[PDB]
Write a protein that binds this ligand. Sequence first.
Ligand SMILES: [Ca+2]
Length: 309
Amino acid sequence: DPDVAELFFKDDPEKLFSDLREIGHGSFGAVYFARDVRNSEVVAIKKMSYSGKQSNEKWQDIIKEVRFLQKLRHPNTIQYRGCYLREHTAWLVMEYCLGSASDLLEVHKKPLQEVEIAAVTHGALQGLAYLHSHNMIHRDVKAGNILLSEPGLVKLGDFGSASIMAPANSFVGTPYWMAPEVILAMDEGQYDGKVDVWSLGITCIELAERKPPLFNMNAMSALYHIAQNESPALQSGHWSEYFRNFVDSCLQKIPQDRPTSEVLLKHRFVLRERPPTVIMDLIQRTKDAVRELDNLQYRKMKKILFQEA
Ligand SMILES: [Ca+2]
């Protein structure tokens, strides 16, 4: 059992974790909030079954992600804690992040404050520059994959579409956030980690406006429009120039004009001094808002307070 013996711990996850509560799902399967019985610590577990239809590809997806996750050692990437295997289900365990940037947008039904967008953007950017420095590409940067964790850190999540080498040429990502060069690859081309810089630019707008541009058209049309049309920009003139320029820089259409994530780490938007408690306060005000939600037991965003139950 080659990859099994190599990549997994032998323990039975069922004896290690309890209070599993679903906090997300996708084709892979589902992600869960859980409690590590050994130290009374909360963790996140992504269960990936490989029996459903055809074990084959699901199993390959599992191994690739485990191997990818094993390589990450940066504070702005989700911390991987190991994996277990039981009944055709791989349990990938990770540190727990109580919410994504997207959940934040859903709880307040309002864009984030600019200082908060800067703090979220900066953290995700650091993670991208780290991934890029090792020639990897995330390929699915969006508010839903930027996670918050206490006491107050921003971490990149969901490496299910990631590439371990640049240049890359696969059609992958989430339509509205995909860079033109990735869509162009739809024919036969290649692209950089710069595509993540583009996706980050779209995410910045999503954090400022709750949705990415083109969210009002179907996926196929958006794809055609991203490629063949001008670049979107923040629509309100009220955001500072630093933010405005940061976003327009990320959204340069031709890779060559787009800066690398490393260069962006020196951008004024990201370097402008901000209170040291921004993320922490953002999380606290979010937890507080969720507690006031009407009919909480039935509101999906209650997951933000799972660690209290
Ligand atoms: Ca390839």
